[PDB]
């Protein structure tokens, strides 16, 4: 089973992030899941579509 029920493409600035978890395909979920743990303790799922998240993965070699 996947962790995300919804996904947002909105830009989350560095100042509001605690951690970004990247979950690839498999382990119960067919899609790639990008989970953002915010400083305000809320957990936000981000669309692997968003340009800002694409630019980040592109550099995370």
């Amino acid at each position, epitope marked *: 089973r996947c962790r995300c029920v919804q996904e947002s493409s909105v*830009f989350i*600035p*560095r*100042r509001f*992030i*605690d*951690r*970004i*978890q*990247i979950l690839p395909r498999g382990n119960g979920c067919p899609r790639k899941e990008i*989970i953002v*743990w915010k*400083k305000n303790k809320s957990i936000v799922c981000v669309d692997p579509q968003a340009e*800002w998240i694409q*630019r*980040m993965m592109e*550099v*995370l070699r």
Partner: antibody
Amino acid sequence: QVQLVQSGAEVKKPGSSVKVSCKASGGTFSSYAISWVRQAPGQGLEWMGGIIPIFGTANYAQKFQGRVTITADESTSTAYMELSSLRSEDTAVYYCAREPDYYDSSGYYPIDAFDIWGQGTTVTVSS
Amino acid sequence: QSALTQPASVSASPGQSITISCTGTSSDVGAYDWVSWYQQHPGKAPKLLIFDVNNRPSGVSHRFSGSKSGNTASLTISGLQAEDEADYYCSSYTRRDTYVFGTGTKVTVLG
């Protein structure tokens, strides 16, 4: 050799502008943020502003809004700091500094600190 | 301008342990663990000693330690030696999304 190489010493007249360069050597700007900090002779460290080159997002300290423009070219890993309307108080050493990340199997963790500092740039204002 | 409060000077004999306080407000130091410490030698660039209240980057000696209680953060230098004779600055991020530095502390080793 994983460092931030800054442009040379500058001597400027009061009222003129100064553009300081900060090039990453032995690394890239990556997902890191780059901040600009200054230090007047015999005085303390003062955060001017910062930029996240990967998104082009820039923030400035209240005191420096309108006087300072901070830019970055991610393709060459070079960051710039332009300070206008120079005066006696602007005579200082200008440093660029990296705000790094921490990564595990648990994820990406941003670090609000300056781990890599440039050698500094001396900017002298004549009068 | 709205700098964090640090004692101007802290001194002790060689081999002693010293503590440097850094007082801010609920908006900065008091708001989160985004508090770091810097060592600066005369005519040199600052160096990161501590990040995230008490974390040490690679190369920084176990002699340097950090802690935070309320609106006050602290740096502890144990086994004080002549190489520790420098200026010390605390830093914090703010809810006004800026960084703010402490006024600085000159650490002297007494003879």
